[PDB]
Amino acid sequence: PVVALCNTNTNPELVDFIIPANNHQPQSTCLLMNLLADAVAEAKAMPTMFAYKPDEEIQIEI
Amino acid sequence: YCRFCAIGQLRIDLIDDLEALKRFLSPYAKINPRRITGNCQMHQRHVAKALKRARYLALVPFVKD
Amino acid sequence: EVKNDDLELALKKFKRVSLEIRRLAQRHEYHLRKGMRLREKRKIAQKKRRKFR
Amino acid sequence: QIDKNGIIKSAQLHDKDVGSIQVQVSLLTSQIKQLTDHLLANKKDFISKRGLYAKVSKRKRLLKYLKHNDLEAYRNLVKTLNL
């Protein structure tokens, strides 16, 4: 299998696990990537960073 | 932009707006393309017919070079 | 033609309008049929649309 | 001109029916009378002849439908002779 950050208009039949969130814009992609990294980071006995911290994420573009 | 799609004068003849017809008239007594009239079909055919009307009545020259 | 009052701007206008006149003349020295007429009419329409689109 | 407003009120069975069969056949025969003169005037207006063929075919269909379903289908013959 494989999981996909499913942007709308994509084929759902190819994908097996659907993540319906924006990915063309970076402001959502950064948060989603950080969340999935935190989800996978528990395997190392290394504590998570986000999803439990009240501090807001960073975003810088120009 | 079209002068005639926005006001809705609903009738075209020689004494509705003759100076508008002159503005629509070319410098060489012709008819301007779609890029000037600002519309596609119906006010355009109206003004073309009216310019022909005045042409037959000799309100604007057939040719003027 | 008219409007010859500038050394070169009027010249540019004159040459452009004369090129238009020549193109309008190009369809008036040979024989053609109605279907052929519709053919170059559609071709010119498509070419101008590609010029603008 | 056919003057529909003047002929609608002359073949009716009620005071509100406007789509009855009798008013339909009256309209059809009025069109026949008008367009016969029109075609005998203009002998090359063939689209008009096709349209007249269409209305006469429709009138024949209506007459057949009446003569099939309803016995009372010959009031319009005694006033305007047909067939």
Partner: protein, 167 residues
């Protein structure tokens, strides 16, 4: 129906003779005379008509029967004192219904919108803002009544797990 008639005069003659010949042409009408008397002064033609350069243009509009037109056609052409013969009944696309004409506000909106009075106003057409009337009533309502009782089912998306038990 109503008609629109344009009439011409020969040469640069006086105005009284023009009115007289206009009146003479008017009596040609078969049964109905609802003439309107006005003229466009004097305008110089851009090209000669027969041999002249200027003439008087007169206008008429009456409401009568359609037979009042052919007589003018064989009379005006016979009269050598006319130069043009425009005769239009009504058949250019026209509207007079009293539900569309009361819309001249556009013009009232137009000039003020485009008139330049302050250096701060910046406007350009072809701009969408979608003013809302809050109600259209164009929905074609059709209600129904149920006559049998059965139970429907809810639907979700086809979420598939590839055996989910590799452990």
């Amino acid at each position: 129906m109503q008609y629109n008639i344009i009439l011409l005069v020969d040469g640069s003659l006086s105005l009284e003779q023009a009115n007289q010949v206009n009146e003479k042409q008017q009596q040609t009408l078969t049964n109905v005379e609802g003439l309107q008397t006005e003229y466009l002064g004097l305008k110089e033609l851009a090209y000669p008509i027969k041999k002249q350069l200027s003439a008087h243009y007169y206008r008429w509009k009456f409401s009568g029967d359609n037979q009042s037109t052919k007589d003018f056609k064989r009379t005006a052409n016979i009269n050598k004192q006319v130069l043009r013969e425009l005769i239009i009944n009504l058949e250019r696309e026209y509207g007079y219904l009293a539900s569309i004409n009361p819309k001249k506000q556009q013009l009232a909106l137009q000039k003020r919108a485009k008139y330049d009075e302050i250096i701060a106003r910046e406007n350009n057409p072809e701009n969408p803002d979608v003013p809302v009337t809050s109600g259209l009533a164009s929905t074609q309502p059709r209600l129904s009544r149920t006559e049998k009782a059965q139970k429907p089912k809810e639907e979700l998306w086809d979420v598939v797990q590839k055996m989910g038990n590799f452990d």
